[PDB]
């Protein structure tokens, strides 16, 4: 079995294991702040430096993975708390879209909301152009921010949210369990064929963004990950 | 929302929140030992005392849950390491089958391997009578120990195993992530309609068993659980 | 070469290869519980029955050794989690100090913290009388519980900790590597001359203790050992 | 704390986590064969793809590490069993020396035996030009194959050897424990200042080589590694 596993309880600038793209910043307390509160259309993304081989062309096997992380979003004054965070899986050469407008693209797609990635979003702003639900929500995105499936949710300012994600290679099911701070859990599951949507080697990470009038603190506090590919 | 959540880092024998059935015994270190090493066809089960309402007849809503626990199985001399542990969901009036032969029934079914429950088994012995796979395995059981679906696994004596289970009400998907001792993860998922297989109120718990020649240490070390039923 | 090697994956009460002193008790799962949770100044120790010859008077040779074990400490209610575990090397006639007060003496020293032994401690309580650091720590003790050298550490209740110790005869260096639950490793090393501090034949083992208000579960789960003395 | 940890029980071609350099080959059983038995001056090296940051320029902290691996060397007919294996730590841009003559350079140094690396060698051939001891031996190399310190050892054809290495940041002590096939352990320790000899980011790996007349099977069977840098 081919297994990749890591665990970050705090992050630091200068760690070869992590790739920073955009307005990312590592705070003194170990937290990663994804966007710059003073920039227009700010976009920040952090990825695990090492590419993970999620499926094999030789055997046709797809890996299963278990990951869990925790974030926090907080309101800053005079601005609309937007736009949110997205845990994504993209090709190994992934870069922030060329003329990114930040905002509702969450830093992973273009103006129409298209991109090459699969991910779980925690959207705090309703962009009608992307057919966003009228409330905050968690959604599964497959090559687009016009979510394949969404579930109502509620982002609480200053609250530490915990998430657990399991992807079963067999059923190709991606399930998410979000534990809010009030104790209640929110779940969403969807069948996604990683092998048909992504290349053999990909990179996992987080991305967040804002606009001109929408800005808020997007923090990543911890992240653990484990994937196992059955080699034959 | 109607939420039920508990967390046990250690168990104790005078806890009204726990029901002991069979040869269960609480060791001095807080662990629960499910079977009696010196009893033939030994069977032991532990259940959360309070019935959890998983579905409503009024709204037709089914609850979503997130639970994780860790156990350890260890070999004892001169005996075949058998038969295994099962995390199960059963009617609130659940009792050890009358005249249980222990062994391959895992303490939840009758001689043919039938019963009323839904669970995830960690089977360490191949019972051809229940169509068991030729290796150790994790399986999803629905009213029978002839698993609806199994995945090969490997039970390491004296190793602490961690499991995480997520059941998404919408897709009715039950997914399991088992983190072995060597870091490798094993997963299995299956669509199970709790509302059609179980009553409105059920009890969650664990069960293990042995035979005449098959006996081993079955321990439960910790258990956290959280379920949320949307009431409206 | 004169080599002594053994490996315990589980312990049992009628084993002539093991000496039990004090409140030691072997649980049904194979684990050794060093202290009695109901006794006031409780002290329990377990030693390998056979004396190991660590140095020759003939050829001034000292033995090199590689050992690794794993333990678990857990909080019990209403009591301060104290006092800790110590892996020690002592004269073959070693016995629990006469009139031992348990507590910060860790079962190996007198009231002032003096004794005849060398060992690695995993201290979970700061005894100012022994100049203990203000946090949990691992320390190297040479004839006293006022550690020659300490390193900060963190004891996690119910966590299985693994340790590996290497003593290099040439450099007389004792180095320890503690693998926390967390994945993080802690190390400490110190030059200790076994030949000048201990006699030719010694006994290896573990010891733990508690006080009136300080009590917790001290468990030893496994232990392998190999020593080689060059004879020529 | 910044921790990096991985565990390989078997290797595979096409794993992004591993860099193959030279005549390396992944056998069908999962073992890595470092040298080509049919090539003159054969050299093969395998490295962990991701650079590990061993020390910080910010806080003058150095990381501690614990690693253990197992190898096997086997005689092939008509050839001198040479030249050995070396576990090394080198700059992230490390490549096989231009114009390497294999043989006694072990694939990490030039003709004089100089290079930029720190490692532990398991030398099976006495090269007088590098002041090699007259017998097989384990040695600690610091920027040269003219070992800083060596200890006699004995390579047994077809025997699986296990090694454990601990580097304690504080004392800057590197200690090695080699468990031979017959149960006897061999140890060697040396104070090495990684911060003064190596850059902030390095790569860990293995290297082996042969000559025209000296060739043998050099295999790597498993490898686990964990390093922790105190960030603060
Ligand atoms: C100066 C100003 O008026 N700018 C806003 C833009 O910020 C706005 O874009 C959206 O803003 C919200 C937050 O208010 C979200 O971030 C959303 O994703 C953005 O699309 C655009 C469109 O409303 O219009 C005004 O210019
Ligand atoms: C004395 C002896 O040989 N008895 C065995 C039984 O223990 C055995 O029952 C099975 O035993 C295995 C372990 O070996 C499992 O526990 C299984 O569930 C049991 O059914 C029966 C049937 O094989 O036959 C021999 O008696
Ligand atoms: C009931 C109670 O308060 N008793 C305590 C003692 O337990 C205590 O002894 C020390 O206790 C700590 C744990 O809190 C360590 O075990 C220490 O080694 C013991 O000396 C004594 C002295 O502080 O006094 C109060 O009784
Ligand atoms: C055909 C033959 O005679 N070749 C040898 C060389 O192999 C030899 O090189 C050394 O070989 C030994 C093993 O016998 C080791 O691999 C050593 O490191 C090599 O230097 C050279 C020098 O002895 O000369 C003869 O050609
Ligand atoms: Ca949006
Ligand atoms: Ca079975
Ligand atoms: Ca103390
Ligand atoms: Ca040589
Ligand atoms: Mn959305
Ligand atoms: Mn089965
Ligand atoms: Mn101390
Ligand atoms: Mn050499």
UniProtKB/Swiss-Prot annotation, chains A, B, C, D:
A GO MF label: metal ion binding
Binding annotation for Mn(2+): 121, 123, 132, 137
Keyword Signal (UniProt): yes
The entry's keywords: Calcium, Lectin, Manganese, Metal-binding, Signal
Role of this protein: D-galactose specific lectin.
Assembly description: Homotetramer.
Protein name as it appears in the record: Galactose-binding lectin
Full-protein positions shown: 24 to 255 of 273
